[PDB]
Design a protein around this ligand. Sequence first.
Ligand code: SF4
Ligand code: SF4
Ligand code: SF4
Ligand SMILES: [Ca+2]
Ligand SMILES: [Ca+2]
Ligand SMILES: [Zn+2]
Lengths: 59, 148, 124, 216, 191, 159, 410
Amino acid sequence: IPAPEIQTVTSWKVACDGDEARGLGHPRVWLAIPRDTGWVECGYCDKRFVIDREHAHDD
Amino acid sequence: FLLTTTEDIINWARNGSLHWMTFGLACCAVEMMQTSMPRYDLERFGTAPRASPRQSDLMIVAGTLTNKMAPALRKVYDQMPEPRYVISMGSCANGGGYYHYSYSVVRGCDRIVPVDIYVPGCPPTAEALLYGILQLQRRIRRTGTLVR
Amino acid sequence: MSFLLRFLTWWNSQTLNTQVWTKLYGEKVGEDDQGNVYYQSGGGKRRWVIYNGESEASRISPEWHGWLHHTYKEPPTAAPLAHKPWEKPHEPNLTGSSGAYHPAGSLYRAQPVERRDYDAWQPE
Amino acid sequence: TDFAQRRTMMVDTQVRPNEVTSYPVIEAMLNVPREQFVPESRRDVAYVGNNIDLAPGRVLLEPRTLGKMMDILNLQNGDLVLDVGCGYGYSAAVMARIAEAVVAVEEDAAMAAEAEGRLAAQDVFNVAVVQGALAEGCPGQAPYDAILIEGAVEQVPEALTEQLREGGRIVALFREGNLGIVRLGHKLDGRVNWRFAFNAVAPLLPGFARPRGFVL
Amino acid sequence: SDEALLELAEHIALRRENDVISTQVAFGELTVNATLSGVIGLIEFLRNDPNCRFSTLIDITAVDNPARPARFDVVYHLLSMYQNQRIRVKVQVREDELVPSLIGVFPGANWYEREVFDLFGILFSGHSDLRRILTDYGFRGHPLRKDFPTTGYVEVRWSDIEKRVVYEPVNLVQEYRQFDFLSPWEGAKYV
Amino acid sequence: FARATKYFLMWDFIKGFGLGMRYFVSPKPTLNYPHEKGPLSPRFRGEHALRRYPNGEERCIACKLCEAVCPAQAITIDAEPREDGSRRTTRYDIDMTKCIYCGFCQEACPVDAIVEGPNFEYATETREELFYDKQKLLANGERWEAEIARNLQLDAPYR
Amino acid sequence: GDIRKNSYDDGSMDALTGEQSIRNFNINFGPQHPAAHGVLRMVLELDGEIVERADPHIGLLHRGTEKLMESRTYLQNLPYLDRLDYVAPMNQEHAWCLAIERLTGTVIPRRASLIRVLYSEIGRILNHLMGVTTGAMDVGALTPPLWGFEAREELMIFYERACGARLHAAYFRPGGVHQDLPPDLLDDIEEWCERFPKLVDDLDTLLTENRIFKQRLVDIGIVTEADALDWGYTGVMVRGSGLAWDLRRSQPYECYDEFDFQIPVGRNGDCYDRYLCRMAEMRESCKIMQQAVQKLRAEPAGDVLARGKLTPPRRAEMKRDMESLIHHFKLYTEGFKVPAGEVYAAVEAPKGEFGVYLVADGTNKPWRAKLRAPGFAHLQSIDWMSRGHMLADVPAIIATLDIVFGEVDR
Ligand code: SF4
Ligand code: SF4
Ligand code: SF4
Ligand SMILES: [Ca+2]
Ligand SMILES: [Ca+2]
Ligand SMILES: [Zn+2]
């Protein structure tokens, strides 16, 4: 199954809430992108976050 | 043609003069009553109440049917002259509703009498019932004959 | 027989007295893709639709449903509803037809889905 | 206690509204004192709408059950009736006011002796109490026009239904688990054909159970 | 009203010592536990006594407690419009024990005792018209006992063969689901 | 005497006739159904639907809070890990003849997956058409999403 | 108190009266009968149309609510209350909430308290409009119900705009009310209150001084103070006899102390007095609705639920904070626990005193829930009330008692 949505990020920790205004999404969760695979998927909405390795900024 | 146009006239008269028995069991009867009140005026369709089953064409099972009541509902249905139509109104009559797992409730009025239309809701709004009555009219137009 | 249909029936787009009333007091608000025409009186105090074909209340699409039921003030002509690309077109009530929904195990289906919850051993 | 008012109330509210139209039955139930036909300890509850326990596994049937049971037997002035399991004899006394004579069969010598004493004290003379096993009936005085079985059965033995006259009626309460069906039988061409009458419950009589063994 | 209800409870305990087993005031309500043999005398005293004028019978009900030697509680709720107070009377009843009827005091007790008899199977002595009031004619069992199933045992259907509405054993297309949510943690009672 | 005089002149009947005639010539509030409809608020509890996210994925994650809260036990759910490992239902049934249309399920849902929509005109000719399966509920959500989403926005400040 | 053997002013005794009464004129009055509310089977014994015995058979709408309640949580049981005296559902919800709140020792927010008073009085008008105008239909007046039920239609729209349901709101919750009212809804309730007295005048003009109406109600169903105490009368059934008893004053609950309203009472205790009392109560409820809307506008913004350990959090908090998500998850599945104890919580429902006798045992489900319906006690007295009257008076007597069988049978 292909992801419903891909976002490219420059951080190894992302937050997802369904992108919906003022309580219309899902509970807000923080996800960790593994340094091995470089992507993580939201357990609520299945959105995939993919790391931009060259610009990935460690915090 | 003669016979199909004859049935069309019969279906037209039966749809335009659909008299329903004064028969309400529970809180679905409150919304059924609102359907005949000024906001909706069910009677403007020719759909008027009749106290006696001998003058009724339509039974609206509006409310919970208990085991103790089931013989009485069957009796007055049996005393409707034919054609007779039945509308099941609301969750209790449709399938038992909130009391489906009770010891004293019939789990759906179609265990007692045949049903033509099921109206969903608990209760269906007065407008939802009016929609259901017009769906019965479509059904009669689609399939009505001299028998029913 | 067009006029007679209007004179004798009440399920074909409007009765004759509904048409007269609309002409006297109706103000056109817009149209939907089925050709149903929407009207108002008193600037939206009263709102009604003239059906193109059979007068079936389930033909009103979600585009106009909110306005027709006074949920929203403004018609979809002035304030159109936002639609997602995965949405599907409106369907009326299909109950008396062959397109009616039926459960997968229904005898109407003609291929009712067979159900089981264990795998049986098969002899060699 | 004003048992007369309780008796009238029992007929008005438990018998009449339950499709008991036979006026002979209504007249009989309005007159036979129910409290005189129950154990002394049950005297104050003689007119309650429930089965009265007489002995382990034996009851005096509820007024609705007996009223409807007698109404469908449709007893005539010339009828000879077999009342199986008469208990203290209340049912026999009621039927004695309609039928010509009643043969009341009881299996407990304690209840059979009390039935005779209580039946006599009410001046009931067309009722003979015969002591013996319920499932046997009383074949000495057969054939009978009607048979009433006063407790739940699973099967009615052929020996019992042979004591029924051709064209005779038998009414029995059948038990299928938690379900009780009163059925009315008619003897035709030697076979008793059973039909549904109404739903009511009572404990199973001793000797009327069915043969139930191992089933895979 | 808490001091008032405690004072009233002493008045009742004093004047009807043998009727009263104990009294309690909890959640602003006075409950009197009474003996079965003295309940009618006590309720009569409560109705007529000047200090406690409980001339309205609010209702009578029962509670089932299968873990107890006397499994049933019969509960009398009484209101006084003149004193503007309420009281609850509780008596413990064993299965097959008879409860004296209150219809001599309150004619309106008649239907409440029929309901207790119907739904719990408790018989009342001295009742003029004791028959089932809420269940179907010839119903088997007493549904509000904790050991009676929610769905009962039998259900009705119209039979085309008998041309009657007949009873049949219960068959559920979907069996009743009874979720168990209760947590294994009670929590604390902080001082 | 004054009351006796007025009854002789039928004043109570005359007043009624006059009141009747005042109503006779007054506007009628009757709706011209099906052309004209009653008012529905955004909170109206109508037909059930299963919603999707703006990205097209199902919102339901098979938490079963709706099935647990349902007073009528009208909801039946079975779930497995999907092929991609996602937590999703394989069965989601609502028995619409058991449902009491209370809206507890949409209150319990943590992701706004199950809602009661604005539709109320779906009377059926057979009872089994009211046993809604997952695809039927999702089809309702795909057809009614635009109105459902707007109603959620309107009532969000009160939820 | 038994008239079956006729007694004549000339002392005559007929030969037939001597015989025992075996063949009596018994008639099923209901269930399928316009005056029987669909589910009343009253067996009447008539003697020249004089009612000599009335034997109500009830239970034709008994659905085992009290048994069904024992296998559900406290929140899952709230909609069952809606469906007892279903003409005014939120008034019945109130007793359930009050009982739980007392056992848990919970205080509800001020705004929720005002809303409960507001919609309780809407329910009283919803009930009295139904009772008075269908009571008029019982004595042959066709028009009053049509006028009254148009006003009911407007009030049912106020129901729907608060909770999304026209009848079975499930709106009062343990801990307050589910949602806050939109400001435009308060404007519309105020606008409706300004018109409503005009309808009450019109109904009064049509009925109150009509000679036919008076001859159908005056001196019918007379109740004395002593009769009221025999049969557990409450509500208008006692106030019509002149007893100024109203639970909102005698045993105040919510915030009724700070509202201004009066208690109508009758002097003759007949069907006419109880009709006048109900018409007057409708005017008083309209005034309360006006005060409540003014208080709600003057209130500072606040919550409508107690939150805490009793009610779920708001949805926005549920989707952001870990504690809120847990409390949402747990309170919608297990629900709150109610400490062991027993309470009887009563309200002045539109039909009389409605009460819940709740036995809690410390778990999340009621051990026993006994529902005290005012109509159960009122209907039981119909035999005494109807004895001696004619058959035509029976529908008027059924009306005056204000019976709905969702609560009689439960
Ligand atoms: S379906 Fe709902 S509204 Fe209709 S009778 Fe049953 S409980 Fe009442
Ligand atoms: S609306 Fe209520 S009864 Fe219907 S599915 Fe949702 S929670 Fe269950
Ligand atoms: S619809 Fe909502 S509450 Fe129900 S299982 Fe899906 S996510 Fe959970
Ligand atoms: Ca995926
Ligand atoms: Ca007499
Ligand atoms: Zn996400």
